[PDB]
Write a protein that binds this ligand. Structure first.
Ligand SMILES: [Cl-]
Ligand SMILES: [Cl-]
Ligand SMILES: [Cl-]
Ligand SMILES: [Cl-]
Ligand SMILES: [Cl-]
Ligand SMILES: [Cl-]
Ligand SMILES: [Cl-]
Ligand SMILES: [Cl-]
Ligand SMILES: [Cl-]
Ligand SMILES: [Cl-]
Ligand SMILES: [Cl-]
Ligand SMILES: [Cl-]
Ligand SMILES: [Cl-]
Ligand SMILES: [Cl-]
Ligand SMILES: [Cl-]
Ligand SMILES: [Cl-]
Ligand SMILES: [Cl-]
Ligand SMILES: [Cl-]
Ligand SMILES: [Cl-]
Ligand SMILES: [Cl-]
Ligand SMILES: [Cl-]
Ligand SMILES: [K+]
Ligand SMILES: [K+]
Ligand SMILES: [K+]
Ligand SMILES: [Mg+2]
Ligand SMILES: [Mg+2]
Ligand SMILES: [Mg+2]
Ligand SMILES: [Mg+2]
Ligand SMILES: [Mg+2]
Ligand SMILES: [Mg+2]
Ligand SMILES: [Mg+2]
Lengths: 197, 215, 199, 220, 213, 204, 196, 198, 196
């Protein structure tokens, strides 16, 4: 797995590969690892598929109820907090690395990492999964402050493509999501659409 | 080898009318890392015999060295005698069994393809000295993913032409690329006929990812 | 397996069952567990079948060479010592052998227990194998040095039989031998099912 | 075990072999691996036989309760949620590996469900010890929007690949075809494997077996 | 941790007749839940009147048969005659025992003619324990085959039955039947059955089809 | 192996309008025989029997706890249980202990108390049910039993032929098992009668 | 280990047990009693793990006595054997298993004498004779050899003496004295100790 | 450790960090991991310091003697072969990942990897614990036909990135350029090391 | 377990050993002899691991006899004890260690009686009395209580009898008979077996 999210002015871009492995058998080659938690809040999932699906479903429930009570769009920070509370409390029973990214009217585009252990940190961009080792140098060299949305999509597509080449546990298609005030735009990069080097 | 380091995945083989074809990707994996993406895992042994190897790449290079020298030695004599594919396969069986029995295996599974006396040869040798012949072979994940497709075609049509066997091998390599996490979309195909051993590559398969819009 | 042997006035009685098992599976009901070393020496098989057969066949080889070199048959004491010395070198390597070396030499009837653990002991009566405890019970209550020949046969036969009853790993047929001064004889071979009818 | 499912143009095709093993011995030659969940939803099972039996029975009865209450036909997503939430709670100790397929108001749906409680929504899936053989066939030959007969042929080919290449698979192929209009539970669909004829008869007469004691009790 | 052994499957059977011996095996070579090949016989001709069946670890089966073949020629060279069935059996006992501390993972059955022209069957454990048998099943499905042979050939547990000599025709039908039955239950036994009949005329072979699943 | 601690073998076999069930009689602890008349087949009705192989303590416990539940069922419902319902009741009992199971794998043999139709099944130790039309086996010599049953069984056997088939299957199977045997008991269930026989058997 | 033996005759059961309590390399008691009176015509003989033996046996004892007080009549030997088995089997998979091996000997007015064998797993078997301990391995075959169902009380005692002498001869442990008791229609009788 | 070598037209560039750790203590912060094997042949060492020093010293001996016997500058491929023979033969007793790079008149600038296990492949090459973090970077940045100056920059950048992320890498960057004209060595320290914002 | 005991008096050494050869739960021999004659006035008593005991003791025996044949006179008890220790200590860290515990008893014409204790590690100690086996735990204190350096042969035998009776009473293993021998200026003398 490789997952990644980038903040820009007015929103976020999320990305993931689509490979699910049992050992070195690919059980699912078109996995969807970007899960919507609310209208403009997503999470990228890495680790145990059982764990991240269960935690995501639970947070969706919690944030949905919370949002109805308050009668307002939820904060991205609240979504991240709900993930952190579960991932921290059950750190001995979970293998889950989450990125929470989205837009709210209060703080705009936000990216939060909740790695294994259940710490929570806001970042300009975040990477996770087994495949992320291979692209630390790339993202550190390529990232620029003040990137547009189109540039963030390209930056994410490139980074994931590089990770996907090297990491046996990553591969398939690239799923991308852009989140802004105006809503969510999803796309898939497959075959020739995937950047080549 | 107690512990394999850089490794290669599946090797495939199928007999056809007038020869044999084998295939292997060009990847050496270091655990899950796709580390060396342009290495050959196929060897021309002599004019009638070729060899492909799964497993530890260093151990393969050693066998290439040993077996390469063996064929040079024989050619020096110029006596009109030459190692048949069956003889190479026999030698390999003995060598692997010998190393296994010393508790110091060569960490490889191998496919020997050959053509001699108007007869196709296809043989398997594993690191424990298990060896046999079959009309089609597939090592590693190929055993689970490619061999069922190979045996399916050979059931309805035992005798394949060269082009039919080539199409079938390309189809299997596509499946392995889809389903084996240690595979790579860059492979070689080696063919042995009356004309000798040819090695083609690098080759690629075209992929289809339409099912990505079917969730 | 159940094997037994005992010295008495008229020589040495040797008896065995005939069952071989691989786990709980019965591989054979017709194993010959009394081994004919030479016309004057018997050995018995308990523990590992290959281990007993191989090493006692090696004993038979050595005993014959000895006879040729020395112009006289080997004593029971010396034969059992040869076997003990052979297997001692292999202690802790997982040999499984429990044997009785039975004969008649210048000292009269001879009976030694020899095992892969390194034991070598002379004795009046022995029983070896998974079923030995059950045979000891019967043999001990019936044994006498001044037993008559037919009485000795009956006791050996009955003791093995009772072992086959209690011990899952003993059964098949009861094979009985008698070592006399001029060599051993094969006395009888009785299926356990036939003995059930009788007793 | 080889189990598989495809989404075709008009619905779902589920498939399964019929071999059950205990160790490396065939215990059952005609085991039924396609389980009823509701009239519109079926489920193939691999893994621990008792676990898949009891798990599907439980969700099935819960879904009957559900649909008796709503008066509506159950949804595949409901079966999926109920299965995964229970399997997650048990942390993989219930060894149920399931292919869940059905047609509801939102159309055909196919899920794979693993013992730890992860699920995938997919157009084709395989499970069991024969799953890689079956998946080879799917990767080779699957097309979207297949006709009913094409999809049936593809699934039966996938199961057959498992039957012949996996020591854990054998005997018959069962199919289940689910559309909006019909349900075809085909058991068996094909019988590729048959016992050879007996060359000698061992018909023993009365008295061949020796009897020690006999007691006859008449009944009412 | 490297393991030098793997189980490759296979069932072998031998029956001794008055003037014949049968050695039979299936043709499947397995590993794990997979099939290597459907055409791998477990029977090997040693002489004109001796055949050996070998099952277990295929690596060891191959090595051992090559060792036996060499030893036969060596014996013929120094003794100026072919090895008897009994001599082969005795020799194999010592070969197997030479690896007592790193065994051949093999189950062997020898079938052929003795020096009087009578059928002889010898069965072995992996370390060379052996005896002469009237009939014997070995390998994967041996616990399935053996009880019926005890019943049908040995006449065990049967009252009011004449103990007739075993004809070749009845022996051949029994061999086919037990294998077809084994192919129903043992996952390792299948594909085809290879039968070797040893008589004074020579060794002739017959093959019957088994379930492919 | 926990299932081989006490040894034991049971099988059931289907005939024309009749069923049979048989069991060895040995109670042992590993190698040591303790008794030669251990009950392994229990009546669960006039024409319905359960046989249990495995751990002797669990054989007894499951028999007794199943009778408990069956007695209550029959009193409540005012009818005899159908064979398939007993199988379900047994499956339920065994699966309750999913995470600490009884070490017994039962076989059921009976006639439907109204149709007199033959029924046989077996269950694993956690209660997975398996219904067949031929035979079922359970115990430490399952392979030996499969070999005999596959060879000897024929469809639509009369009570006399069915008796001989299950007798020969059991005798010849247990004679290749060190920890099974010391006698065989056989019940033939018919519409109008039960016939119980003990066979002449090896006692080694 | 501890030794138990029972021999059922036509109208009596004879029972015996060793009188040693061992700890490490020493005999700590030479007049130990391993028999527990359940009722007027029932004895429970219990061996196994320290603590477990007396705790279990005395629990059964008090419950068998309570039954009598509540109902005005005693449990039959068969009812008592099943009660014992129920309790031991119930505790098998609990936090408190009891590692005990038992003989239960009894005489019922209607059923006659009975001897029951139970191991720590709680398998119950009715037997004409039975033995527990390592000593059983050396004595069971002597019983098989000489026992007949019609054996008199006089002969049973001599057959017991044969078993005990075998232990003296062949068994590696020092077991010099044995408790001997008989149960019949007249209740439980203390016989002389058999000593060496 | 991070080690790296790049071929250009007419030679090679080698680079390494300078960190030697025992656990998470830095025992040597100015290690020299580029070892000369001959006049124009170097190796970059990663893994056990004991193993790579011993193997390097042994190969230097072997290649030096060989070179005198033949009376010619040694082939880079020969140096690589000598490393491979030792690293393969004693693969169970060694913890060594080597890059061999240099120039010879016959084949020019050459880079060989000899990873753990003792396989040998001609390639640019990266190795050490730190190399994981720069696979994506080198795959994206590498261009065919790079000059010497560009190779130095490419190597300096890649090592700098690896050094930031890998706790087992750090210190100074040692660079070597090898061509027909000889060997040029330099050290990048402090501000000289390429910088990237957090 | 095997029992050895030695008691040195003014002009004699008294030694005794059990006569049991055990295997698992059974005594296989009740007339076993654990004493080896080295020379006219030396006995070696050897217990421990099966095989090792007889192999080691007989090796020393043949070497002590060879010394006599080569030199025309015998090893002194002290020389024999050290020879034994050298061999056992030399094998301690070899491929062939011997797991044996020994007493060596002897009379020298010039030095008088001697008793040596050696354990399997090959530590050698001269002692006025010594014992090997689990039985030693129960008997050493009786020796400490009653022994005096001037003890007569008559009293030594009765003191030995006290130790042996203690084993009958208190020791958990069945050791019914003992070999008894005495060494003095006139050589080795076989005394009566002490039996129970
Ligand atoms: Cl997922
Ligand atoms: Cl929700
Ligand atoms: Cl993480
Ligand atoms: Cl992460
Ligand atoms: Cl991951
Ligand atoms: Cl993928
Ligand atoms: Cl490469
Ligand atoms: Cl080549
Ligand atoms: Cl026999
Ligand atoms: Cl000699
Ligand atoms: Cl002796
Ligand atoms: Cl034994
Ligand atoms: Cl008698
Ligand atoms: Cl869902
Ligand atoms: Cl499965
Ligand atoms: Cl209950
Ligand atoms: Cl130098
Ligand atoms: Cl490396
Ligand atoms: Cl490296
Ligand atoms: Cl490193
Ligand atoms: Cl540093
Ligand atoms: K990849
Ligand atoms: K089969
Ligand atoms: K650093
Ligand atoms: Mg028995
Ligand atoms: Mg978990
Ligand atoms: Mg199959
Ligand atoms: Mg039996
Ligand atoms: Mg406790
Ligand atoms: Mg080192
Ligand atoms: Mg030793």
């Amino acid at each position: 797995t490789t997952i990644m999210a980038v903040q820009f002015d007015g929103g976020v871009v999320l990305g993931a590969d689509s490979r699910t492995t049992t050992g070195s058998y690919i059980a699912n080659r078109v996995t969807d690892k970007l899960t919507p938690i609310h209208d403009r809040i997503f999470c990228c999932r890495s680790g145990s598929a059982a764990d991240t699906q269960a935690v995501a479903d639970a947070v969706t429930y919690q944030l949905g109820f919370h949002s109805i009570e308050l009668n307002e769009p939820p904060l991205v920070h609240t979504a991240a907090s709900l993930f952190k509370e579960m991932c921290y409390r059950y750190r001995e029973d979970l293998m889950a690395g989450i990125i929470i990214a989205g837009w709210d009217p209060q703080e705009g585009g936000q990216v939060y990492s909740v790695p294994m252990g259940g710490m929570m940190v806001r970042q300009s961009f975040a990477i996770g999964g087994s495949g992320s080792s291979y692209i630390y140098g790339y993202v550190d060299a390529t990232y620029r402050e003040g990137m547009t949305k189109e540039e963030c999509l390209q930056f994410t597509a490139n980074a994931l493509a590089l990770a996907m080449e090297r990491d046996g546990s990553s591969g398939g298609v690239i799923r991308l999501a852009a989140i802004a005030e105006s809503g969510v735009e999803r796309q898939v990069l497959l075959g020739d659409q995937i950047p080549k080097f | 080898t107690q512990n394999p380091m850089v490794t290669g995945t599946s090797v495939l083989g199928v007999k056809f009318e007038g020869g044999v074809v084998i295939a292997a990707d060009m990847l050496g994996s270091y655990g899950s890392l796709a580390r060396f993406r342009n290495i050959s895992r196929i060897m021309r042994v002599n004019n009638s015999t070729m060899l492909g190897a799964s497993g530890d790449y260093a151990d393969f290079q050693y066998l290439k060295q040993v077996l390469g020298q063996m064929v040079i030695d024989e050619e020096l004599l110029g006596d009109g005698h030459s190692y048949s594919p069956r003889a190479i396969h026999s030698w390999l069986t003995r060598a692997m069994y010998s190393r296994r029995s010393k508790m110091n295996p060569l960490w490889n599974t191998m496919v020997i393809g050959g053509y001699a006396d108007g007869e196709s040869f296809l043989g398997y040798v594993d690191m424990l000295g298990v060896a046999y012949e079959a009309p089609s072979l597939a090592t590693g994940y190929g055993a689970y993913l490619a061999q069922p497709l190979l045996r399916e075609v050979l059931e309805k049509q035992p005798v394949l032409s060269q082009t039919e066997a080539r199409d079938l091998v390309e189809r299997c390599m596509r499946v392995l690329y889809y389903r084996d996490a240690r595979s790579y979309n860059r492979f070689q195909i080696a063919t042995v006929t009356e004309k000798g051993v040819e090695i083609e590559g690098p080759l690629s398969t075209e992929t289809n990812w339409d099912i990505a819009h079917m969730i | 397996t159940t094997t037994l042997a005992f010295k008495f006035r008229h020589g040495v009685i040797v008896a065995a069952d005939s069952r071989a098992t691989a786990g709980a599976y019965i591989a054979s009901q017709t194993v010959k567990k009394v081994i004919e070393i030479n016309p004057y020496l018997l050995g018995t098989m308990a523990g590992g079948a290959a281990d007993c057969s191989f090493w006692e066949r090696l004993l038979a080889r050595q005993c014959r060479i000895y006879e040729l070199r020395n112009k006289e048959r080997i004593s029971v004491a010396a034969a059992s010592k040869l076997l003990a010395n052979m297997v001692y070198q292999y202690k802790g390597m997982g040999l499984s052998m429990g044997t009785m070396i039975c004969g008649w030499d210048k000292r009269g009837p001879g009976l030694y227990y020899v095992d892969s653990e390194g034991n070598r002991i002379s004795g009046a009566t022995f029983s070896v194998g998974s079923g030995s405890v059950y045979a000891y019970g019967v043999m001990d209550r019936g044994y006498s040095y001044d037993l008559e020949v037919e009485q000795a046969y009956d006791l050996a036969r009955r003791a093995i039989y009772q072992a086959t009853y209690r011990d899952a790993y003993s059964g098949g047929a009861v094979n009985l031998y008698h070592v006399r001064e001029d060599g051993w004889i094969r006395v009888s071979s009785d299926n356990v099912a036939d003995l059930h009818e009788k007793y | 075990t080889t189990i598989a499912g495809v989404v075709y143009k008009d619905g779902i095709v589920l498939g399964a072999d019929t071999r059950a093993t205990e160790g490396m011995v065939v215990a059952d030659k005609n085991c039924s691996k396609i389980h009823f969940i509701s009239p519109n939803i079926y489920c193939c099972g691999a893994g621990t036989a008792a676990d898949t039996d009891m798990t599907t029975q439980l969700i099935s009865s819960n879904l009957e309760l559900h649909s008796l209450s709503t008066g509506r036909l159950p949804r595949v997503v409901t079966a999926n949620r109920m299965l995964k939430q229970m399997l997650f709670r048990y942390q993989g100790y219930i060894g149920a590996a399931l292919v869940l397929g059905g047609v509801d108001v939102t159309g055909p749906h196919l899920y794979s469900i693993y013992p730890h409680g992860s699920t995938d929504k997919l157009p084709y899936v395989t499970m069991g010890s024969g799953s890689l053989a079956a998946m080879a066939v799917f990767e080779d030959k699957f097309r979207p929007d297949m006709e009913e007969e094409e999809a049936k042929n593809l699934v039966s080919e996938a199961i057959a690949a498992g039957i012949f290449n996996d020591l854990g698979s054998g005997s018959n192929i069962d199919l289940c075809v689910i559309s909006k209009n019909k349900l075809d539970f085909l058991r068996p669909y094909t019988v590729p494997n048959k016992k050879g004829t007996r060359l000698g008869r061992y018909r023993c007469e009365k008295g061949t077996t020796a009897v020690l004691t006999e007691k006859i009790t008449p009944l009412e | 941790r490297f393991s030098p052994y793997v189980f490759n499957g296979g069932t072998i059977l031998a029956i001794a007749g008055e003037d014949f011996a049968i050695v039979a095996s299936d043709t499947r070579l397995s590993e794990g839940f997979s099939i290597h090949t459907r055409d791998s016989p477990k029977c090997y001709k040693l002489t004109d009147k001796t055949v050996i069946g070998c099952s277990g670890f295929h690596g060891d089966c191959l090595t051992l048969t090559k060792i036996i073949e060499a030893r036969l020629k060596m014996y013929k060279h120094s003794n100026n005659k072919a090895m008897t069935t009994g001599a082969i059996a005795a020799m194999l006992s010592t070969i197997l025992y030479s690896r007592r501390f790193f065994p051949y993972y093999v189950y062997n059955i020898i079938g052929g003619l003795d020096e009087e022209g009578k059928g002889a069957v010898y069965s072995f454990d992996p370390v060379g324990s052996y005896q002469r048998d009237s009939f014997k099943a070995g390998g994967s499905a041996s616990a399935m085959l053996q009880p019926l042979l005890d019943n049908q050939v040995g006449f065990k547990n049967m009252q009011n039955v004449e103990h007739v000599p075993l004809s070749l025709d009845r022996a051949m039908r029994l061999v086919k039947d037990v294998f077809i039955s084994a192919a129903e239950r043992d996952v390792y036994t299948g594909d085809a059955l290879r039968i070797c009949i040893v008589t004074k005329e020579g060794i002739r072979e017959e093959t019957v089809s088994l379930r492919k699943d | 192996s926990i299932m081989s601690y006490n040894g034991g073998a049971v099988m059931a076999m289907k005939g024309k309008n009749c069923v049979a069930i048989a069991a060895d009689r040995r109670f042992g602890i590993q190698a040591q025989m303790v008794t030669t008349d251990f009950q392994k087949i229990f009546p669960m009705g006039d024409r319905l029997y359960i046989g249990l192989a495995g751990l002797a303590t669990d054989v007894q416990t499951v028999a007794q706890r199943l009778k408990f539940r069956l007695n209550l069922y029959e009193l409540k419902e005012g009818r005899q249980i159908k064979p398939y319902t007993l199988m379900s009741m047994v499956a339920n009992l065994l699966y309750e202990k999913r995470f600490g199971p009884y070490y017994t794998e039962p076989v059921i043999a009976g006639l439907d108390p109204k149709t007199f139709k033959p029924f046989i099944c077996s269950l694993d130790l956690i209660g997975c049910p398996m219904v067949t039309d031929d035979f079922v086996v359970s115990g430490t010599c399952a392979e030996q039993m499969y070999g005999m049953c596959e060879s000897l069984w024929e469809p639509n056997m009369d009570p006399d032929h069915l008796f001989e088939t299950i007798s020969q299957a059991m005798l010849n199977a247990v004679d290749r098992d060190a920890v099974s045997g010391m006698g065989v008991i056989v019940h033939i269930i018919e519409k109008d009668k039960i016939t119980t026989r003990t066979l002449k058997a090896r006692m080694d | 280990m501890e030794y138990l033996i029972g021999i059922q005759g036509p109208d009596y059961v004879l029972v015996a047990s060793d009188r040693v309590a061992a700890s490490n390399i020493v005999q700590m008691k030479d007049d130990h009693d391993k028999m527990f009176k359940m009722s007027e015509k029932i004895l429970l003989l219990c061996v196994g793990e320290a603590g477990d033996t007396v705790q279990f046996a005395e629990y059964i004892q008090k419950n068998v006595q309570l039954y009598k007080m509540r109902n005005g009549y005693e449990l039959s030997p068969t009812a008592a054997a099943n009660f014992t088995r129920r309790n031991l089997a119930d505790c098998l998979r609990s936090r408190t298993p009891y590692h005990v091996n038992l003989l239960l000997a009894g005489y019922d007015e209607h059923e006659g004498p009975a001897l029951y064998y139970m191991d720590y797993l709680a398998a119950l078997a009715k037997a004409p004779f039975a033995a527990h301990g390592y000593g059983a391995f050396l004595t069971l075959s002597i019983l098989d050899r000489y026992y007949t169902p019609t054996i008199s009380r006089e002969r049973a005692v001599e057959l017991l003496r044969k078993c005990l002498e075998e232990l003296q001869k062949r068994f590696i442990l020092n077991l010099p004295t044995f408790s001997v008791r008989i149960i019949d229609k007249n209740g439980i009788h203390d016989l002389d100790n058999i000593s060496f």
